[PDB]
Amino acid sequence: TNFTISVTTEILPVSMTKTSVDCTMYICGDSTECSNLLLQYGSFCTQLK
């Protein structure tokens, strides 16, 4: 015979922070020889990027 209007809150995530990871700087910075060996290791950096 009656009613009760109630308001409910729903929280849904949409996105997050877009993080870009540098290849040479995170692994070994200010190192030319380490970058040379790294490139030899393969092409993982292009796939990760």
């Binding site: 540098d22 290849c23 040479t24 700087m25 200010d30």
Partner: protein, 50 residues
């Protein structure tokens, strides 16, 4: 494409001001040496090894 960086210009050495020479003559040009069961121990500190 890639990542850019700033190359260094020169190098700076900041070793402490030590002028006395290490006494390597008494450990390498000694008259006699000890045995393996009674080996000596010489502490070398606060000098410059050329």
């Amino acid at each position: 494409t890639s990542n850019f960086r700033v190359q260094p210009t020169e190098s700076i050495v900041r070793f402490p001001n030590i002028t006395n020479l290490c006494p390597f003559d008494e450990v390498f040009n000694a008259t006699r040496f000890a045995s393996v069961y009674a080996w000596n121990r010489k502490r070398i500190s606060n000098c410059v090894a050329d």
